[PDB]
Structure 1
Amino acid sequence: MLGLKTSIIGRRVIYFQEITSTNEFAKTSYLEEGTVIVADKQTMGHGRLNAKWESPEGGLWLSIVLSPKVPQKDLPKIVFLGAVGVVETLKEFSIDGRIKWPNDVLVNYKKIAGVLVEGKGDKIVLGIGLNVNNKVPNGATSMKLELGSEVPLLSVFRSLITNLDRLYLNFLKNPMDILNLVRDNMILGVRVKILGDGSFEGIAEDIDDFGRLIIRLDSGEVKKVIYGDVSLRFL
């Protein structure tokens, strides 16, 4: 009854009033490619690592099942499809989102959405959490707070799924296209610090052909940061 017109993403949608985590469900359940798992609320929503993802009523919490018949090397760009999809949807709603490498979307440096890509067996689960009308953690923002009005959650869902289906279908044919879209929509030319063992600081110059963040240290040294269990701070 939703009448979705997409080719792959959205062929099937499993909606939950409440769920632990859409990503967890998508990983442990057999689902055909393109299946979207979405819930009004998550009781165990999580981000990267062991970070909790606040998922109250009013937000858009979903996961998409994929298994791209593309080179192994291109897999790490799936996260970017999610981020760019969110950016495109936000633009449709008069909001300018900027990508904070590698999986966050900020609006005036306030986090409005986060992407989490995982894999079980050989299916890839693309998780996206976007704040719409829900309450958000301190420092974060939402479509409602940015527009100062209640936004129809289903309208945002339809928009995002439409953008993702297009981005994904193109990715399957031209896997390098997403990189330039990210470059034109990400925060660059600013100083950042990479936390953890062997931490260092420098200017985030760009992302390379593999999506690695290129940082220029003050000494002139150039380091390439892979995205995974990485922690980045804007200085």
Structure 2
Amino acid sequence: MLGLKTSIIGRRVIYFQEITSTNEFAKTSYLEEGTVIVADKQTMGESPEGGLWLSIVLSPKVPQKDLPKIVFLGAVGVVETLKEFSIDGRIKWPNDVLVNYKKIAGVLVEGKGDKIVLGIGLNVNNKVPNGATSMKLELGSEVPLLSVFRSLITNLDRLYLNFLKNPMDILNLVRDNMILGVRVKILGDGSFEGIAEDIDDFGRLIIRLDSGEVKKVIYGDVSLRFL
């Protein structure tokens, strides 16, 4: 009934009225590649009704080092879908999507054995905390979740197929949609402060500290705050 016209992502979709977290379920249960887990609400994500909470199971046959690029696949997918709804989203390394500097979506990737779980949380019609925003607030009208879901899954499927053929291509795409060349404060890792200049082949953030040292920050235990 969902009418998805995708190759891999979305061949199977499993919906729950409520669950601890879509990522949790995806990591602890066997699901065929491309399976999408979606829920009206997440108990231990407290992701409210109205938002789009999902996880996608992937097992790309690409080098072990190219795996970290999956978070970017999710972020770009969100940016593209937002564009279709006339919203301009920008990526804040390594996994957030901002609209006029307010967070509208976040990506969480986790590995479990030979499978990767791509989690995406997008504020659509749900209430959001101060500082954040939603498609509803940005458009001044509620937007049908199914519409956003179909758009996002279709964009992600296309990006994933291209990624499987040429893993390196996503890098330039994420760069053109990422906020770079600005001062940032790293949360986690070494808590560095400096100029976020670029991302490398692995997806690490290349930052120049005020001391002049240039460091590469890895994804995982990190978040950024623009200064």
TM-score, normalised via structure 1 length: 0.93
When residues 145 and 72 of structure 1 are mapped into structure 2, their CA distance, relative to the original with a 3 A threshold, is same
SS of residue matched to 2:211 = coil
Q: What does 1:43-62 correspond to in 2, within 5 Å?
A: 43-44=43-44, 54-62=46-54
Structure 1 stretches of 4+ with a deviation exceeding 6 A read none
**220-229 vs 70-79, which moves further:** 220-229
Q: Is the 8 A contact 2:52 2:124 kept in 1?
A: yes
Aligned equivalent of 1:212, options 200, 204, 208: 204
1:218 deviates by 2.4
**115-124 vs 151-160, which moves further:** 115-124
When residues 218 and 22 of structure 1 are mapped into structure 2, their CA distance, relative to the original with a 3 A threshold, is same
1:106 aligns with 2:71: no
1:121 deviates by 1.7
Question: Structure 2: which 5+ runs fail to align?
Answer: none
1:197 deviates by 6.2
When residues 183 and 92 of structure 1 are mapped into structure 2, their CA distance, relative to the original with a 3 A threshold, is same
Question: Structure 1: which 5+ runs fail to align?
Answer: 45-53
SS of residue matched to 2:66 = helix
Deviations 1:92-142 (A, max 9, x none): 000000000000000011000000001222111000000000000111000
**Structure 2 CA distance, aligned partners of 1:176 and 1:101?**
17
When residues 152 and 193 of structure 1 are mapped into structure 2, their CA distance, relative to the original with a 3 A threshold, is same
When residues 149 and 216 of structure 1 are mapped into structure 2, their CA distance, relative to the original with a 3 A threshold, is same
Tell me the equivalent position of 1:137.
Answer: 129
TM-score, normalised via structure 2 length: 0.97
SS of residue matched to 1:205 = strand
1:165 deviates by 0.1
1:219 deviates by 3.0
1:189 deviates by 1.4
Quote the sequence identity (%).
100
**58-67 vs 192-201, which moves further:** 192-201
Q: Name the count of aligned residue pairs.
A: 226
**84-93 vs 205-214, which moves further:** 205-214
